[PDB]
Short mmCIF file of C-alpha atoms in Angstrom, two decimals:
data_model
loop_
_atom_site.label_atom_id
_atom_site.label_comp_id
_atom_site.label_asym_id
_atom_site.label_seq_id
_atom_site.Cartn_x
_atom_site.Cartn_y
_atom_site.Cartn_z
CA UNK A 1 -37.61 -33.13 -8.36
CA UNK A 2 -36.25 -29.99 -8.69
CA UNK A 3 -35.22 -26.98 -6.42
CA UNK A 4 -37.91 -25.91 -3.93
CA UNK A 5 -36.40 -22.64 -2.71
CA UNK A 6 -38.01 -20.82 -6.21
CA UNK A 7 -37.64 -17.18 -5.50
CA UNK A 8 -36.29 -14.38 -8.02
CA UNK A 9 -35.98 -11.36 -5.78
CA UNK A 10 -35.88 -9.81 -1.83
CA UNK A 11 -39.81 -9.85 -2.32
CA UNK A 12 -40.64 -13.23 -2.90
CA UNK A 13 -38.08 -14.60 -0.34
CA UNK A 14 -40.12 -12.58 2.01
CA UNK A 15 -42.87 -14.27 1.17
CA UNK A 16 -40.92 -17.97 0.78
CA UNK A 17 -39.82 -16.94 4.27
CA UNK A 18 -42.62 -16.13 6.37
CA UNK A 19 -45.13 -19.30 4.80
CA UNK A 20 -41.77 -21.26 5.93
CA UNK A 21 -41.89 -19.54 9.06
CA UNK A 22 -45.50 -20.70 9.91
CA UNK A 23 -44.78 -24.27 9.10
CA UNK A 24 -41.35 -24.17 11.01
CA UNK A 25 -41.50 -22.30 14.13
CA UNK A 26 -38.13 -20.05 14.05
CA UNK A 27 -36.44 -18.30 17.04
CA UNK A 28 -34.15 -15.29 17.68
CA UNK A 29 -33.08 -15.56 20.44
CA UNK A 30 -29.42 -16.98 20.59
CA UNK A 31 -29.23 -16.51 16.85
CA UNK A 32 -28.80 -13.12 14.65
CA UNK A 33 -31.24 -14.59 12.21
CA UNK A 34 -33.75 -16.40 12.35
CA UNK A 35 -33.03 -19.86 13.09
CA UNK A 36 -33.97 -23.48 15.12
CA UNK A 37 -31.86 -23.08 17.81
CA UNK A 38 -34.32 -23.12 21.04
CA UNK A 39 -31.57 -23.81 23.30
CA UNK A 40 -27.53 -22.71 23.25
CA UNK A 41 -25.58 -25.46 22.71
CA UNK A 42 -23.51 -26.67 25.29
CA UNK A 43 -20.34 -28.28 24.75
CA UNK A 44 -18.58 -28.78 28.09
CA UNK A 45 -18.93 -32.66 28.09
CA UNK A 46 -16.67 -32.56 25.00
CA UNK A 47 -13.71 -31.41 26.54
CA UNK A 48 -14.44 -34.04 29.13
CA UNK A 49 -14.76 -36.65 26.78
CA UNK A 50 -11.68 -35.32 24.76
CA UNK A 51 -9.61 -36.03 27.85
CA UNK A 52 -10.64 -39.33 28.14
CA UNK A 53 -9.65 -40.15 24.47
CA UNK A 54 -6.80 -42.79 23.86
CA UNK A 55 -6.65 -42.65 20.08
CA UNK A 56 -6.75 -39.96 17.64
CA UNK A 57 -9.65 -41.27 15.30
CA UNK A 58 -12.25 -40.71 18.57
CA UNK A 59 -10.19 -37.66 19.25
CA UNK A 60 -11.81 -36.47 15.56
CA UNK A 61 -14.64 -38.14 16.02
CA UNK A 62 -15.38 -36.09 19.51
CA UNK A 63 -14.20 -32.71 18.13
CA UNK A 64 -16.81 -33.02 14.91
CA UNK A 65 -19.63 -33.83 17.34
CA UNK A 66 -18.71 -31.29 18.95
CA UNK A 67 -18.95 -28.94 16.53
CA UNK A 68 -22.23 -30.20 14.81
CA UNK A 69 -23.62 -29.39 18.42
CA UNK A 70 -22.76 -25.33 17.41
CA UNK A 71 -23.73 -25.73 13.80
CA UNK A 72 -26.84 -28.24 13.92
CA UNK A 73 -29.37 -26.03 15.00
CA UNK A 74 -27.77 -22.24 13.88
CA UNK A 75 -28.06 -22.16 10.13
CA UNK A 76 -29.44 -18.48 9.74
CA UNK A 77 -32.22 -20.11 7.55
CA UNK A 78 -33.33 -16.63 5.37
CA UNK A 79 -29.48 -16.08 4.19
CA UNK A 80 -29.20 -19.72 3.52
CA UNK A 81 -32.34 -20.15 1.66
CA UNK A 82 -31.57 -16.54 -0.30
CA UNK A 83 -28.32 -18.10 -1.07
CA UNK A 84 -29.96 -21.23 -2.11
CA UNK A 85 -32.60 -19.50 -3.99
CA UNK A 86 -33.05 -20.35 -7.48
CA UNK A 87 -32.73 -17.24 -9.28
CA UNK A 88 -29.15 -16.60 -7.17
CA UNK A 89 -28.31 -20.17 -7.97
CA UNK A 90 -28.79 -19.51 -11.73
CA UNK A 91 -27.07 -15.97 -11.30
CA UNK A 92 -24.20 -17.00 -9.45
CA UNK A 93 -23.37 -20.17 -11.71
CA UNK A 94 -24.51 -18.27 -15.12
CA UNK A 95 -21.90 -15.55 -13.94
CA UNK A 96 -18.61 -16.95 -14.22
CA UNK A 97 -19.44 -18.51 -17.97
CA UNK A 98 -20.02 -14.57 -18.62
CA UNK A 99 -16.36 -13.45 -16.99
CA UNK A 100 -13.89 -15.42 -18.66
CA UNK A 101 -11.34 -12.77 -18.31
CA UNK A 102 -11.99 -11.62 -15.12
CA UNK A 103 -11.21 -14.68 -13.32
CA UNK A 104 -8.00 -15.69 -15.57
CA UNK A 105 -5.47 -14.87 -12.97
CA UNK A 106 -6.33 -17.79 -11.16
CA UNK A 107 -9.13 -19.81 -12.39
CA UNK A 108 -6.39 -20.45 -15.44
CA UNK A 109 -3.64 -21.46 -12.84
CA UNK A 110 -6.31 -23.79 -10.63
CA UNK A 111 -3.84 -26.54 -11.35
CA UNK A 112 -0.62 -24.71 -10.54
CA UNK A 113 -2.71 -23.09 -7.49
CA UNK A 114 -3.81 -26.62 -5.73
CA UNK A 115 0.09 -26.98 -5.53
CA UNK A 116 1.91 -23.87 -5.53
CA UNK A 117 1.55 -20.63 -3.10
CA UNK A 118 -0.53 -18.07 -5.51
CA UNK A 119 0.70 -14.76 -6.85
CA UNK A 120 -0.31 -11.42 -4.92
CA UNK A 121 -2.01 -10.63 -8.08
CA UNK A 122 -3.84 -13.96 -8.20
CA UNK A 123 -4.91 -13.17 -4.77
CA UNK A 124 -5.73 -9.56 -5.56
CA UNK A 125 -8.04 -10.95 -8.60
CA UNK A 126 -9.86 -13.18 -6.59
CA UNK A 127 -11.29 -10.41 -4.23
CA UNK A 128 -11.84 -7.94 -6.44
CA UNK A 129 -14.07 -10.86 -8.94
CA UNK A 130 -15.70 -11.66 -5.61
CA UNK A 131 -16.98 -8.44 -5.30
CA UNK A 132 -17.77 -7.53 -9.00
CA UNK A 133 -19.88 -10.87 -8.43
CA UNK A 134 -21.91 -10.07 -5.84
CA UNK A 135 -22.62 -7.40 -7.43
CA UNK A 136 -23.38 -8.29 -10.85
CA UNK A 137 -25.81 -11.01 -9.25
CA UNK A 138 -27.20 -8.37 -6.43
CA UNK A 139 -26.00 -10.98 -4.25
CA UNK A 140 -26.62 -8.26 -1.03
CA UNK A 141 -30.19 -9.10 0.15
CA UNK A 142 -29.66 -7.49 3.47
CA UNK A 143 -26.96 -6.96 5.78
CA UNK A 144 -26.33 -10.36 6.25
CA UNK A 145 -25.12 -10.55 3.24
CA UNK A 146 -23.36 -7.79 2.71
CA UNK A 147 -19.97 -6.77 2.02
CA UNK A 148 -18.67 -5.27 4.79
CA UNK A 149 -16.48 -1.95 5.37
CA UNK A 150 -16.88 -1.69 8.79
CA UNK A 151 -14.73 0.03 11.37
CA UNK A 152 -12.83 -3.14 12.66
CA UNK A 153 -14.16 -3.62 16.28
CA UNK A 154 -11.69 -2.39 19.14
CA UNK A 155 -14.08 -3.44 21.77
CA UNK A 156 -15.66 -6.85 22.42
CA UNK A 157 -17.83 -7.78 25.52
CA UNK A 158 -16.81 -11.35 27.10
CA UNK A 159 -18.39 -12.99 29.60
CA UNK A 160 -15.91 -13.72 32.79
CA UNK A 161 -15.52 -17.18 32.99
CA UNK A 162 -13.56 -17.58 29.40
CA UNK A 163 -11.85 -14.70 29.42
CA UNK A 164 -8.58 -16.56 30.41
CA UNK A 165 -9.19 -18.72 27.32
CA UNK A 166 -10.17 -16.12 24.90
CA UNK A 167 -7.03 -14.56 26.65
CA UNK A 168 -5.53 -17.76 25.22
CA UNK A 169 -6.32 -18.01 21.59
CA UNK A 170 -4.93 -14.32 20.90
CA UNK A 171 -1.62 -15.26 22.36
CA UNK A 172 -1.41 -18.01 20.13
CA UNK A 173 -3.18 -15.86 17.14
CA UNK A 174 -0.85 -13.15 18.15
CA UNK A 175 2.29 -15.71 18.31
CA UNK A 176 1.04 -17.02 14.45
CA UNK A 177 1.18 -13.26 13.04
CA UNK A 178 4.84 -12.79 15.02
CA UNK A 179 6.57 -15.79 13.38
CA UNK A 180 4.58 -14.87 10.24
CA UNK A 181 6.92 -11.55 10.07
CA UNK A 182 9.77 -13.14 12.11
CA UNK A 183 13.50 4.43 14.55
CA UNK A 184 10.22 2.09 14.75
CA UNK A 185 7.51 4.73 15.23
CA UNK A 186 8.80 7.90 13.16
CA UNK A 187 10.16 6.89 9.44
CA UNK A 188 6.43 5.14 9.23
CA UNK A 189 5.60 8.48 11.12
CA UNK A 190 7.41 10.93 9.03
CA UNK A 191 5.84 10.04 5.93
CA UNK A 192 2.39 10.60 7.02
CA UNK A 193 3.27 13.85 7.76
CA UNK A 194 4.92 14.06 4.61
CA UNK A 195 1.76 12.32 2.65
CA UNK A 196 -0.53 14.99 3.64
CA UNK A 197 1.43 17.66 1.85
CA UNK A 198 4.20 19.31 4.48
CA UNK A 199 6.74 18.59 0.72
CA UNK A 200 8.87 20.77 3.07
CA UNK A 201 9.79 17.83 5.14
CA UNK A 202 12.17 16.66 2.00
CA UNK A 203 14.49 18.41 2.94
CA UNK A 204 15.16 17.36 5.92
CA UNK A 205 14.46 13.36 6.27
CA UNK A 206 15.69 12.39 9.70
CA UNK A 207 17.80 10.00 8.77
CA UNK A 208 19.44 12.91 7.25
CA UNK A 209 19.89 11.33 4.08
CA UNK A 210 16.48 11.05 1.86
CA UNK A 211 17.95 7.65 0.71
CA UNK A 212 19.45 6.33 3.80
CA UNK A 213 18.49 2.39 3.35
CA UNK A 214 18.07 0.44 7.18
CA UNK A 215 19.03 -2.88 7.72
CA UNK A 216 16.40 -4.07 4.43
CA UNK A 217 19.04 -2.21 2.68
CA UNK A 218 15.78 -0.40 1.21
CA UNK A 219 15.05 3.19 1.45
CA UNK A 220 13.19 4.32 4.34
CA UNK A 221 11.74 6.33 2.58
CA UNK A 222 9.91 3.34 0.36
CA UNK A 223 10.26 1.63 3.66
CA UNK A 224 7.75 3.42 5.57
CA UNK A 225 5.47 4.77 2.60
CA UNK A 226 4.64 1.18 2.26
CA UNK A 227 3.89 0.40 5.78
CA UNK A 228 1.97 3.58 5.78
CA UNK A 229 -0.22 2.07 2.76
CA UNK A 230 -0.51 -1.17 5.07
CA UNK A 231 -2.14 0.92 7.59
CA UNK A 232 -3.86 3.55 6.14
CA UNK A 233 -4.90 1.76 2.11
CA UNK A 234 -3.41 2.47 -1.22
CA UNK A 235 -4.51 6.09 -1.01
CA UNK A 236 -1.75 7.15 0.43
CA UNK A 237 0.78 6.47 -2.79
CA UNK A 238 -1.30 8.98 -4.84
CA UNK A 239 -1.40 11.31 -1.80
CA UNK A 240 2.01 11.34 -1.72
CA UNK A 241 2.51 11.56 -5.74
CA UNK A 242 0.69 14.99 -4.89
CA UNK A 243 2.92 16.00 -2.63
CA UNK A 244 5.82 15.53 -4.97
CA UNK A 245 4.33 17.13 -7.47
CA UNK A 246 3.53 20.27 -4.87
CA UNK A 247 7.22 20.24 -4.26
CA UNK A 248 7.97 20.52 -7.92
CA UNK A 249 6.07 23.49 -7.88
CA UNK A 250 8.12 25.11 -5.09
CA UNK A 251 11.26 24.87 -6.45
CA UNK A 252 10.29 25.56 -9.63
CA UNK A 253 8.82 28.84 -8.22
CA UNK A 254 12.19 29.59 -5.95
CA UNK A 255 14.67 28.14 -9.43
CA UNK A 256 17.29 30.77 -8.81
CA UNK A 257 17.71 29.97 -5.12
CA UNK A 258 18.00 26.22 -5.72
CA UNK A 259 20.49 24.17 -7.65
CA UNK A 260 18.22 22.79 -10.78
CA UNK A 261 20.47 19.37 -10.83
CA UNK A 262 20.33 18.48 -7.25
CA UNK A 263 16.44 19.51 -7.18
CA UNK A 264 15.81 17.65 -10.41
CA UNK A 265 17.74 14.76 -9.08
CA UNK A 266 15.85 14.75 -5.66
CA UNK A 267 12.03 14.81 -6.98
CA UNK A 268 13.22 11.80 -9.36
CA UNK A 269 14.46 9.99 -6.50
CA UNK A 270 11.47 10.36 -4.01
CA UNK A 271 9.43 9.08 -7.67
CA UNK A 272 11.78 5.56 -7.32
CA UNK A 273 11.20 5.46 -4.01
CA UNK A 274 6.96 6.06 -4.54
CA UNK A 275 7.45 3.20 -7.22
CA UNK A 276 9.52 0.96 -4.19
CA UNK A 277 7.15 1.39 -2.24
CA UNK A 278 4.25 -0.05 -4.48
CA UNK A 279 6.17 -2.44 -5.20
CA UNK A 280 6.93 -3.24 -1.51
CA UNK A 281 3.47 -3.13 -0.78
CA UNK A 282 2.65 -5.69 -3.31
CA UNK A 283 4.05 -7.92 -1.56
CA UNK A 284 3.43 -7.03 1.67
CA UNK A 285 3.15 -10.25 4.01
CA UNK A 286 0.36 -7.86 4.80
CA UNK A 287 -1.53 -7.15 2.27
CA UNK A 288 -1.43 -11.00 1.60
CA UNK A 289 -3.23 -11.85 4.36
CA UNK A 290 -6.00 -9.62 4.16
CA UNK A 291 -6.34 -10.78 0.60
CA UNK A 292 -6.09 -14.58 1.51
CA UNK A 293 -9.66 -14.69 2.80
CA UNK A 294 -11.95 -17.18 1.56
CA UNK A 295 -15.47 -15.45 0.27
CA UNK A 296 -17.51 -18.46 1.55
CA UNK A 297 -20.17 -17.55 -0.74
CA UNK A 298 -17.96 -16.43 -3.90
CA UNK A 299 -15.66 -19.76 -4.04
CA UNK A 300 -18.99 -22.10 -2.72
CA UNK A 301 -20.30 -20.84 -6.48
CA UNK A 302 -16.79 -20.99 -8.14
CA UNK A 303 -16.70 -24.80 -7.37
CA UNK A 304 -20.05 -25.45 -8.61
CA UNK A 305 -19.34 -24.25 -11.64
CA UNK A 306 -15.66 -25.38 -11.81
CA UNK A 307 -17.64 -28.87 -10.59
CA UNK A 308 -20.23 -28.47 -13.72
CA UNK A 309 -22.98 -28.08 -11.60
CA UNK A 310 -25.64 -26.75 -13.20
CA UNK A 311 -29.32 -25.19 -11.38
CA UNK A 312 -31.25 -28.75 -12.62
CA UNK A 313 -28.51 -30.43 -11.00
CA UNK A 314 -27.92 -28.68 -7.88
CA UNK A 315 -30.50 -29.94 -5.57
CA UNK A 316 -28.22 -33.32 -5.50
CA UNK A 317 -25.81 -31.21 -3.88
CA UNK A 318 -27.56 -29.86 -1.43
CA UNK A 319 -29.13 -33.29 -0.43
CA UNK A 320 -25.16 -34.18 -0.35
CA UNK A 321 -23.94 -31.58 1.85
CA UNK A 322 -27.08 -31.55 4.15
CA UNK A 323 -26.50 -34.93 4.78
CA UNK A 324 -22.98 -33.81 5.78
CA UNK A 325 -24.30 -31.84 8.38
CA UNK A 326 -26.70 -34.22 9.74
CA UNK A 327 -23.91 -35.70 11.55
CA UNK A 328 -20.53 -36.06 11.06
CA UNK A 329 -19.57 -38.84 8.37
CA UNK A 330 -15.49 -38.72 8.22
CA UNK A 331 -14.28 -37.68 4.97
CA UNK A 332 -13.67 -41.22 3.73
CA UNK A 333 -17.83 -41.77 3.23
CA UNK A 334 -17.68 -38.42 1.89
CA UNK A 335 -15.16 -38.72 -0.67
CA UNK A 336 -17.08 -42.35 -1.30
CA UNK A 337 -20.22 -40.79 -2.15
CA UNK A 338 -18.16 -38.31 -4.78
CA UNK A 339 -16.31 -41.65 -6.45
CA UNK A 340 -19.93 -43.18 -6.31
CA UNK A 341 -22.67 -40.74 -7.79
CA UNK A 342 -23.46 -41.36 -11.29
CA UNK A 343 -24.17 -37.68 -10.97
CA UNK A 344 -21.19 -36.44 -13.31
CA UNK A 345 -20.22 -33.46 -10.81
CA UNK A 346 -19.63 -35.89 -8.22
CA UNK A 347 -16.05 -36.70 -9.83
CA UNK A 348 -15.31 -33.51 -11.26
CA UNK A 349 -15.90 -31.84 -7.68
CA UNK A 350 -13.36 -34.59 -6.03
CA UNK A 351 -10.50 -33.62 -8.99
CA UNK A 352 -10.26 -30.05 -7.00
CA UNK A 353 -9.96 -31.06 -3.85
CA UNK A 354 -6.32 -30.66 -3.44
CA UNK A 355 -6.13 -32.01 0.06
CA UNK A 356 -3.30 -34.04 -1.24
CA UNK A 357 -1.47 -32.02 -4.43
CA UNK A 358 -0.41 -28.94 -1.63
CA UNK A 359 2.97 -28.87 -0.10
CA UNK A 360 3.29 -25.32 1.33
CA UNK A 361 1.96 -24.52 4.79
CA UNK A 362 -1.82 -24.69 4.27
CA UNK A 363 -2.13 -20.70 5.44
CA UNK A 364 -0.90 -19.37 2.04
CA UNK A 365 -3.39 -21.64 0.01
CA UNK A 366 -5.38 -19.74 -2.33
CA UNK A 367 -8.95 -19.13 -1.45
CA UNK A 368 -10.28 -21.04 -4.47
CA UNK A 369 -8.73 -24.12 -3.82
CA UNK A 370 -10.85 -26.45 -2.74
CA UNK A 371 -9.89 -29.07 -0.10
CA UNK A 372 -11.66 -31.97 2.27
CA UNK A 373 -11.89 -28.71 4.95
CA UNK A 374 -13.24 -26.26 2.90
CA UNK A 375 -16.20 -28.63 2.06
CA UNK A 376 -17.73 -27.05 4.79
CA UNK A 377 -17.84 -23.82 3.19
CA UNK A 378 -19.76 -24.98 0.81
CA UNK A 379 -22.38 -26.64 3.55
CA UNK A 380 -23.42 -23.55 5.35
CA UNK A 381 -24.08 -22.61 1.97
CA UNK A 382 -26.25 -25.09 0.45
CA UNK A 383 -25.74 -27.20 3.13
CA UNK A 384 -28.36 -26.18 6.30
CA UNK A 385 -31.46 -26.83 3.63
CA UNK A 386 -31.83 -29.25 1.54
CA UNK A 387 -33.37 -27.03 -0.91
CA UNK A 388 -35.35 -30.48 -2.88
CA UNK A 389 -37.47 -30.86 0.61
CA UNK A 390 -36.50 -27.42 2.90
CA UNK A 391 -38.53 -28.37 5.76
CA UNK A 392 -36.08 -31.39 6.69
CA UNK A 393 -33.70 -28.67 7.54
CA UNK A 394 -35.62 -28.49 10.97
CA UNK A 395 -34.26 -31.59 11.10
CA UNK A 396 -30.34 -29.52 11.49
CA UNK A 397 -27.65 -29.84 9.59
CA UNK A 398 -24.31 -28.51 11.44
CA UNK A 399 -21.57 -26.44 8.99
CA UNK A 400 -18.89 -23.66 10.61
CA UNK A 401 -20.27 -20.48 9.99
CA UNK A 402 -23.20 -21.76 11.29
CA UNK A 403 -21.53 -20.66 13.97
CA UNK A 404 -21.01 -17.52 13.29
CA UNK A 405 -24.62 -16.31 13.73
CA UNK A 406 -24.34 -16.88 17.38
CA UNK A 407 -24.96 -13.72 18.74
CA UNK A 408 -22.30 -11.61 20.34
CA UNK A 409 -24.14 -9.02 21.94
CA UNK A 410 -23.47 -8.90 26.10
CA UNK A 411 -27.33 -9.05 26.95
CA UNK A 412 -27.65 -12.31 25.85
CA UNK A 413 -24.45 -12.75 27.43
CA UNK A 414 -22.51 -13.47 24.21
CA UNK A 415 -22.87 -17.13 23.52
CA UNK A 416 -21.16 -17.11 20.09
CA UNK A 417 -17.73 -16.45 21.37
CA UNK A 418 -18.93 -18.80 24.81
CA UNK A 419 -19.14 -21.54 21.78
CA UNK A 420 -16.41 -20.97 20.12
CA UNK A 421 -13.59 -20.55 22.87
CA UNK A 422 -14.99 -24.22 24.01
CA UNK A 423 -14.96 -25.48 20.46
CA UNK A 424 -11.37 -24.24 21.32
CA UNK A 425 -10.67 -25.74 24.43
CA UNK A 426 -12.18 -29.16 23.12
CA UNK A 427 -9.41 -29.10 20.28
CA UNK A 428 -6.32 -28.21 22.64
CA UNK A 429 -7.19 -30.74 25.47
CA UNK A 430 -6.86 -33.15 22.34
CA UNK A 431 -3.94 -31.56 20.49
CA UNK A 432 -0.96 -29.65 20.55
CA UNK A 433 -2.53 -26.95 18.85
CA UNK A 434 0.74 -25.06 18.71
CA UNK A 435 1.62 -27.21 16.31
CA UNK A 436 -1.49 -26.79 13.83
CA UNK A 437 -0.95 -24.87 10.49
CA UNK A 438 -4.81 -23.64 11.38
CA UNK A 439 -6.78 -23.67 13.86
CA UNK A 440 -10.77 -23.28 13.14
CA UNK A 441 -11.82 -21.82 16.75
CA UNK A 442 -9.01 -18.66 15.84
CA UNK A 443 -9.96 -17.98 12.58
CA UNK A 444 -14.08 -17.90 13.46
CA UNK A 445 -12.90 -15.48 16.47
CA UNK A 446 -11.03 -13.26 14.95
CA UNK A 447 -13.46 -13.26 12.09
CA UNK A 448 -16.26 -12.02 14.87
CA UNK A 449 -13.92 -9.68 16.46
CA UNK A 450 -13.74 -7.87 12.41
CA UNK A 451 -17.31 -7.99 13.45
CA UNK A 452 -18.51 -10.74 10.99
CA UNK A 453 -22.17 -11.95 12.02
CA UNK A 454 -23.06 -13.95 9.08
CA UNK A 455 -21.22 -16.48 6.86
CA UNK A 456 -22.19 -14.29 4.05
CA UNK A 457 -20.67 -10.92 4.78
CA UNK A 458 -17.44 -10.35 2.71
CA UNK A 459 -15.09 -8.46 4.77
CA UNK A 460 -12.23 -8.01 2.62
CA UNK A 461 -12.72 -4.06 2.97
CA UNK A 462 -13.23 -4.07 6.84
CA UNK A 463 -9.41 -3.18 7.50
CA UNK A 464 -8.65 -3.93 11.00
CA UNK A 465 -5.47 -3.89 13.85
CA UNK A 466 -6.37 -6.95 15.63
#
């Protein structure tokens, strides 16, 4: 009773596809793929019911139903079943036997990790082996699945009537990335000037002194190059080693009209200040963020493996997590059936969960650690079909990104982000959200608004302002 999804390559999950498509009956309409969602789900009796609540347990229960109402019937079902396929299920599990070495920085710390906030260069490792993943396995059927670049999405249609809420949720997102971090335009401005090779500008920093150091008691100088790198990528530290070295070439050429120790001294000390900068933007608060994003595909794999899950076994895991879906089950019966399985993965997967082994605020958790939540990562993954018999996924099987195929576009009058502000409003009429580390409706809109449209796009590239 093996895996039924048997498909090796884009062809043959065409063909997979469209004899499931005959048996199944698929629509488009709300969804950006395919999918069994006839109707958009509507979740304003939740928020009704939430009010109504007296004790936090039916609180839960009411914001999981809830949610299985915008998961249950999304699942874009060709992404899914690719990502379920059995030659990517081989792939993606055979692959991280293969890179030992690649995935040391963190896979080697997994203990340390479920406790401790990670290195930069832990977090660093884990998007670059993401990527280097995908592509080893040719992950990247279609666009769905691919790892996005993209602009970063200045502009997003809302419909009227939430627009106060989505007003809302960026206050409080905004608020999160203030506290986060807690003259303004030019030393950030002057070097990009500088950066593009006007060395000139040396000469005359603004501050007056090239090493005048501002309240940081840190250059400027390093100061602003490193914001500049925030903005604009790593580029922009070789740029400017260019410049430098354009500079040297100046006074070189003009050595009898310049004193050779004060020139010598200067192009060493813009060098330090290159190197500060790097080293600043390292650990930029930044540059941790962007690289703090879970690859829902890339760690869904790194568990199985870490879990011992092999492609013989891994049907029993999608039967577990599409029964997950089916409706919610509390994490207690969950964490049962893990304790309970003489399947041997069952225990091995419940020894990462480190749910209860974190003490720092849950943001700066690693995006390999596995946790109660992040089960549901793993769901929309293997969790919409249960790949032994696919066709009782018509039967729906909720998970979060589910969500995020809801389409966005204004002509069908945008009812992802319609879903997801109520998800939203469900969760504050029951909580002070202020108070949450995380809050799930934020994170899936601001992963939209980066102009994510399938759990399977990776957009640690896409580099966006809000």
């Amino acid at each position: 009773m093996e895996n039924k999804i048997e498909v090796n390559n884009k062809d043959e999950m065409n063909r997979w596809f469209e004899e499931f498509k005959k048996g199944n009956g698929l629509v488009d309409t709300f969804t950006n793929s395919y999918s069994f969602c006839e109707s958009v789900p509507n979740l304003d009796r939740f928020v009704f019911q939430m009010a109504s609540a007296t004790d936090d347990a039916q609180k839960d229960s009411i914001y999981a139903s809830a949610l299985v109402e915008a998961t249950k019937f999304c699942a874009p079902i060709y992404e899914c079943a690719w990502v379920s396929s059995t030659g990517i299920v081989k792939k993606g599990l055979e692959w991280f036997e293969k890179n030992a070495g690649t995935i040391k920085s963190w896979d080697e710390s997994y203990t340390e990790l479920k406790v401790d906030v990670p290195k930069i260069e832990q977090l660093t490792g884990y998007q670059q082996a993401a990527l280097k993943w995908r592509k080893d396995i040719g992950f990247r059927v279609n666009a769905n699945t691919a790892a996005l670049s993209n602009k970063v999405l200045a502009e997003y249609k809302v419909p009227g009537e939430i627009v106060m809420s989505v007003k809302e949720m960026l206050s409080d997102m905004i608020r999160r990335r203030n506290l986060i971090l807690n003259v303004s335009h030019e030393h950030v401005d002057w070097c990009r000037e500088f950066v593009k090779g006007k060395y000139i500008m040396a000469f005359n920093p603004p501050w007056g002194d090239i090493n005048k150091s501002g309240r940081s008691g840190i250059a400027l100088v390093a100061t602003g190059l490193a914001k500049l790198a925030e903005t604009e990528g790593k580029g922009i530290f070789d740029e400017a080693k260019k410049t430098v070295e354009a500079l040297n070439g100046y006074l070189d050429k003009h050595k009898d009209e310049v004193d050779r120790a004060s020139a010598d001294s200067m192009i060493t000390n813009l060098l330090k200040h290159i190197a500060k900068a790097q080293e600043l933007y390292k650990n930029s608060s930044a540059l941790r963020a962007q690289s703090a994003q879970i690859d829902t595909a890339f760690s869904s794999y790194y568990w199985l493996y870490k879990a011992g899950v092999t492609p013989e076994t891994f049907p029993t895991v999608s039967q577990f997590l599409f029964e997950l879906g089916k409706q919610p089950r509390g994490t207690k019966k969950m964490k049962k059936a893990l304790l309970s399985t003489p399947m041997k993965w069952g225990k091995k997967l419940y020894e990462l969960f480190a749910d209860d082994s974190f003490q720092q605020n849950r943001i700066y958790m690693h995006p390999a650690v596995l946790t109660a939540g992040r089960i549901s990562e793993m769901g929309v993954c293997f969790g919409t079909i249960p790949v032994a018999n696919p066709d009782d996924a018509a039967q729906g099987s909720g998970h979060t990104k589910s969500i995020l195929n809801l389409r966005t576009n204004t002509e069908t009058n945008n009812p992802c982000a319609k879903t997801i502000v109520k998800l939203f409003e469900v969760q504050k009429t029951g909580f002070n959200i202020q108070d949450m580390d995380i809050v799930a409706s934020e994170h899936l809109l601001h992963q939209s608004l980066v102009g994510k449209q399938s759990p399977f796009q990776n957009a640690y590239n896409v580099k966006g302002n809000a």
